[PDB]
Amino acid sequence: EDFRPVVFVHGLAGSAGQFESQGMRFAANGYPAEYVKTFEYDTISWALVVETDMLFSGLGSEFGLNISQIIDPETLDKILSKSRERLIDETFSRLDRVIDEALAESGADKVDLVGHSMGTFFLVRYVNSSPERAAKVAHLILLDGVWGVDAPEGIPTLAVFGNPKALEEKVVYNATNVYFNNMTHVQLCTSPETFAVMFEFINGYKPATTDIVPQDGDYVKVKGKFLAFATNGDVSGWLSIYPIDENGKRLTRLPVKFMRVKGDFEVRLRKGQLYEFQFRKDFSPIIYHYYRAPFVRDDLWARFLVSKPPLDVELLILPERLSPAAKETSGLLLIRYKEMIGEYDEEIGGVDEVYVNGVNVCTERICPIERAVNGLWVFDRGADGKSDLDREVVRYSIMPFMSAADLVVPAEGTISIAVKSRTGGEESFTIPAWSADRHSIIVQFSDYIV
């Protein structure tokens, strides 16, 4: 009611998915869910044309390093041909539109802006580009990004920094700077404690709760989007939603919702009910099955990542998807917007455990701290029917925020997945063992277990 809209800007290879839990937290504290907005943009182009400096002569050395490897030298020519100033103006005008719509919709005169990682560079340039744009910002929140520069003039800014070893000397001048040395890069963005500090910083009081509070009623409104990983463009395809049982078995002959999707979609589902989101993206025979915990309240920020050029990470698994053994094994992708760490460290204070059919794939070698694993690929490397966990899957060592585990997952019956979080608590799933020749399985773990 007496709240301002907040607009979040993600980092490189990120999306609104990183603010999904904070959105639910804002709503559980009285914000109308619609007052929390996200701005999505193409991070590969932004980084290559605008943040070149951060990319190679600074912060994001990791993506910079494997830019030449992950992208077609010709394709990179096209992106690098693009004009910097044109790109900036066109992207800033689009953000101006999101902000203005948020202002009209709430009657508020200003909004709060929040950036994470590259998003902080983005927002600082944005607020500094014109007096007209800054006048509409009540508070600026910079999460684990830019340091060593001035906070925009006259804009209350708060910079929050996490543990540096995830590749207190980080200060934004004139901003309130605080630190959470117990947190990793993405975790800092989705964490309930970052939520309490952001909330307090913009509202002047500690929120009553930091939990994702189950709302009353049988239904939840879900607004989501199937988009390209990293470039974030709309993806078209067909979506079938099926309520499922404790073992992943479809409870209905026909899907409870079937629809053509061109990016965003909105649907009404049951609160606390497990669901399988099956998707077929235009021009691909593969059937995707996305699984995640039940929705306990409205979620207007759900994201289903799809692999597409020029950064088709999924092709790295094609050799195995094409082998005859592929009819015999499953291939899955585990995602958590909170680094899965298999390397013990005191400051971070804990190791996660991730079991697939009883085997722990979050090892020191597979999931070292420096890897900041948010996406773990589990499949039979080489299609040789052997689970060589101690042999690194080299092809993924080049992808940012990812890793892989050579594990044989028989395509018969079900697959059980169990995670024990480094911050405590456990979550598990049991889903069908779809074969890798025609199916792809994606399982997203919640980024916080209370």
Which partner, ligand STE, Ca ion, none, binds residue 232 by CB below 5 to 8 Å per kind? none
Stretch that binds ligand STE, among 197-205, 299-307, 353-361, 384-392 (CB under 6 A): 299-307
Q: How far is the CB of 407 from Ca ion (least distance, A)?
A: 8
E runs forming strands in 85-203: 111-116, 137-143, 157-162, 176-180
HSE on the CB side for 68, CA within 13 Å? 3
**Helix, strand, coil share of the chain (percent; to 5):** 30, 30, 45
Residue 117 interface partner, choices Ca ion, ligand STE, none, CB cut-off 5-8 Å depending on type: ligand STE
Residue 27 or 332 with smaller CB distance to ligand STE: 332
Closest CA to 41 of 4, 82, 93: 93
Residues 113-132 that bind ligand STE (CB under 6 A): 116-119
Distance separating alpha carbons of residues 407 and 334, to the nearest angstrom: 13
Nearest-angstrom CA–CA distance, 445 and 443: 6
Interatomic CA distance for residues 356 and 378, integer angstroms: 9
Closest CA to 389 of 422, 413, 356, 411: 356
Count H helices and E strands in the chain, helices first.
12, 21
Smallest distance, Ca ion to C-beta of residue 31, A: 48
Select the span of 8-16, 272-280, 289-297, 348-356 touching ligand STE (CB under 6 A). Answer: 8-16
Interface segment toward ligand STE; rule CB under 6 A; list 29-37, 289-297, 307-315, 360-368: 307-315
Site stretch for Ca ion (CB under 5 A), options 124-132, 177-185, 357-365, 381-389: 381-389
Which one of Ca ion, ligand STE, none interacts with residue 357, CB within 5 to 8 A by kind? none
DSSP string, 255-290: -SEEEEEESEEEEEEETT--EEEEEEETT--PEEEE
Residues 25-84 binding ligand STE (CB under 6 A) are: 60
x/- mask, ligand STE, residues 228-267, rule CB under 6 A, reads: -x--------------------------------------
Choose between 36 and 333: whose C-beta lies nearer to ligand STE.
333
* Alpha carbons 156 and 149: distance in angstroms, whole number: 14
Binding mask of the shown chain, residues 201 to 230, with x at each position contacting ligand STE by CB under 6 A? ----------------------------x-
Say if residue 165 carries a ligand binding annotation.
no
CA 148 from centre of chain: 26
Cβ 36 vs Cβ 27: under 8 Å:
yes
Q: How many angstroms separate the most distant Cα atoms in the chain?
A: 63
Tell me which amino acid residue 265 is.
Answer: F
List residues near Ca ion by CB under 5 A.
380-382, 384, 386, 406
Annotated binding site: 139, 380-381, 384, 386, 406
List residues near ligand STE by CB under 6 A.
11-14, 18, 60, 116-119, 186, 229, 305-307, 313-314, 333, 335, 374-375, 401-402
Annotated binding site for Mg(2+): 139, 380-381, 384, 386, 406
Annotated binding site for Ca(2+): 380-381, 384, 386, 406
